[PDB]
Ligand binder design. Structure first.
Ligand code: HEC
Length: 107
């Protein structure tokens, strides 16, 4: 979707997550290079067993389902957040996050 627009939806996430150059782990783990990565693998982040042992691979479709209702997808997750219900917002959000490489540089 529209990355400029996803940047604004990302503000809800920024409180707990970093993205971009120099991103560091906070309440939540860095989101650089998210798509394609296996859940619970950012080094130095203390993941819940619920996330670490889930066996999830972060594809766009799986991100989509998770973000609408995190607790429904990963019961017991430390990510206590109501989710993003709006379809367009999710599509924008995806566009924004997809811009980043694992190192925080922009594709
Ligand atoms: C604090 C109140 C959070 C907000 C707001 C958002 N996230 Fe989050 N996120 C948070 C925690 C504590 C964790 C770890 C969960 C655990 O159970 O260990 C997470 C995790 C994620 C993940 C999975 C990451 C992985 O490496 O597997 C994703 C994909 C994720 N968070 C995305 C995300 C987005 C897109 C948000 C904005 C809508 C967002 N989170 C908000 C804490 C918090």
């Amino acid at each position: 979707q529209d990355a400029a627009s996803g940047e604004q939806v990302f503000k809800q996430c920024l409180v707990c997550h970093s993205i971009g150059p120099g991103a560091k782990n906070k309440v939540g783990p860095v989101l650089n290079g998210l798509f394609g990565r296996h859940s619970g693998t950012i080094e130095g982040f203390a993941y819940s067993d619920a996330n670490k042992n889930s066996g999830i691979t972060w594809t766009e479709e799986v991100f989509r389902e998770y973000i609408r209702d995190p607790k429904a997808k990963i019961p017991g997750t430390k990510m206590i957040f109501a989710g993003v219900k709006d379809e367009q917002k999710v599509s924008d959000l995806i566009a924004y996050i997809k811009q980043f490489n694992a190192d925080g540089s922009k594709k």
